[PDB]
Amino acid sequence: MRIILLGAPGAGKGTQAQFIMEKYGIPQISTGDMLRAAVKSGSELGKQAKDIMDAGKLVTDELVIALVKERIAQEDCRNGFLLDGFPRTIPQADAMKEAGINVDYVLEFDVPDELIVDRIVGRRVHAPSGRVYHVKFNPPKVEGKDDVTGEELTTRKDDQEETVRKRLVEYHQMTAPLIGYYSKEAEAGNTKYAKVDGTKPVAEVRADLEKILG
Ligand SMILES: Nc1ncnc2c1ncn2[C@@H]1O[C@H](COP(=O)(O)OP(=O)(O)O)[C@@H](O)[C@H]1O
Ligand SMILES: Nc1ncnc2c1ncn2[C@@H]1O[C@H](COP(=O)(O)OP(=O)(O)O)[C@@H](O)[C@H]1O
């Protein structure tokens, strides 16, 4: 099974991707997580990406496409994968289509801007692993600590309020057109398309996605 999750930054995609990976046994392919890992490792890609992500801008399509191409060639993706934050632009979607990669489900998260801004304020990450929490809506079991390692949680540099505003503007300009892109693919019979109300509690969105995916 192959899935794309579509939605604004902060819509809840990475949170729900964890549950899908656990139940359906397919890896989460998050280009944000992979780019942050490149920074953490000090790879050449990481050297290029850090300043761009910190500014709330998109990394070049050609670099991200190559990153995803290599990732999905790895053994753990042989039987499917979940794309989370990719494709992010029409050229990224066209590259995957040109490559001959169809997906089985495209799942769109419907969340208004007003809620995203307010919501991202509380996002906390365990920076080494990428595990994601919210101080209120999905808190760690011990305040400020990762559930697995007990290490202190951090705030992402690009989650600062002014950067979030910029990121959202760019989402609507560059990324929201993928809604029509994959709606059209579904009309052609190339994928199934569904939209979930991502303003509901985490558990309710999870149940809605479980009903769609079986
Ligand atoms: N597919 C992509 N194309 C270009 N840049 C990307 C892509 N995925 C992630 N990024 C970069 O990583 C940043 C953070 O993205 P992401 O981790 O998906 O955060 P969020 O879930 O808040 O949108 C983006 O603002 C961009 O700089
Ligand atoms: N349904 C929800 N209601 C409230 N908060 C949520 C929900 N889903 C996720 N969150 C929290 O809001 C923030 C953004 O969720 P995240 O999964 O990181 O979104 P994305 O991957 O789309 O950027 C995180 O801090 C997360 O814990």
Q: Of these residues, 2, 71, 88, 124, which one is catalytic?
A: 88
What's 190's DSSP letter?
S
Instruction: Please tell me the experimental approach by which this structure was elucidated.
Output: X-ray
Q: Are strands 131-134 and 123-126 parallel, antiparallel or unpaired?
A: antiparallel
Nearest residue by C-alpha to atom 8 in ligand 2: 12
Task: Say how far apart CA 79 and CA 2 lie, in whole Å.
Answer: 8
Instruction: Give the CATH number, domain containing residue 170.
Output: 3.40.50.300
Starting at the earlier edge strand, list the strands of the sheet with 2-6. 28-30, 81-84, 2-6, 105-110, 192-197
Strand residues in the chain grouped as ranges (E)? 2-6, 28-30, 81-84, 105-110, 123-126, 131-134, 192-197
Q: Which two tokens stand for residue 143?
A: 């305040």
User: Does 132 carry a binding-site annotation?
Assistant: yes
- Asked if 88 and 174 count as a contact pair (C-beta separation under 8 A), the reply is yes
Q: Give the torsion through C-alpha atoms of 196, 53, 26, 213, to 10 deg.
A: 10
- Cα(144) to ligand 1 centroid in Å equals 24
- The answer for residues whose C-beta is within 8 angstroms of residue 104's C-beta and 6 or more apart is 1, 2, 3, 80, 191, 192
In 3D space, the residue among 90, 74, 75, 72 whose CA is nearest the CA of residue 30 turns out to be 72
Q: How far is 70 from 73, CA to CA, in rounded Å?
A: 5
Grouping H, G, I as helix, E, B as strand and the rest as coil, residue 186 is: helix
Number of structural domains found in the chain: 1
Helix (H, G, I), strand (E, B) or coil at 110: strand
Neighbours of 211 (CB within 10 A): 10
What's the domain range around 70?
A: 1-214
CA 119/CA 175 separation, integer angstroms: 20
Q: Are 191 and 185 in contact (CB under 8 A)?
A: yes
* Cα(185)–Cα(26) distance, integer angstroms: 22
Q: Which ligand is nearest to the CA of 158?
A: 1
- 148-163 as b/e, with b when 16 or more CB fall inside 10 Å? eeeeebeebebbeeeb
Q: Which atom of ligand 1 is nearest to the CA of 60?
A: 4
CA 93 to chain centroid, in Å, comes to 15
Ligand nearest to the CA of 30: 1
71 marked among binding-site residues: no
13 labelled catalytic:
yes
- C-alpha distances in Å from residue 106, one per residue of 7, 125, 210: 11, 26, 14
Ligand 1 binding residues, C-beta < 6 A: 9-10, 14, 31-32, 35, 52-53, 56-59, 64, 85-86, 88, 92, 158, 167
Residue 88 annotated to the active site: yes
Residues facing 110 on adjacent strands: 197
